[PDB]
Amino acid sequence: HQPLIARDGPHPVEQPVHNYMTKVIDRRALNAAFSLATEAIALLTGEAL
Amino acid sequence: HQPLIARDGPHPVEQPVHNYMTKVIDRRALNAAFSLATEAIALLTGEAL
Known part of the structure; x- marks a missing residue:
């Protein structure tokens, strides 16, 4: 909201x-x-052991 | 494990x-x-005392 200024004359x-x-x-x-x-993710996430 | 940066593109x-x-x-x-x-082989051993 751009303000203004009163100008005279x-x-x-x-x-x-x-x-x-x-x-x-x-x-x-x-x-x-x-x-x-x-032989990694399956081995350490429940595929045997 | 090396530092990785998730890459765009x-x-x-x-x-x-x-x-x-x-x-x-x-x-x-x-x-x-x-x-x-x-010396110290005939000595230290009892061999020459």
Whole structure:
């Protein structure tokens, strides 16, 4: 809401202005990288023992 | 396990490595001696007293 200042004399008259605006987000879908090993995750998570 | 940063972008999902580093031992000898004369063998033993 942009304010104004009264101006004297032979001048244009200052009018109260407002500005309404919107944006959008941006995704940029992030990844990672993982590597468990064969004879590893099954062995230590309940496949035998 | 090396520090990884989750990566964005259109790249191929980069190759994940989580392994056990193997290293090479060296063998070093650190040799040391001391003499012992023709005395202190007939001595120290009862042989010459």
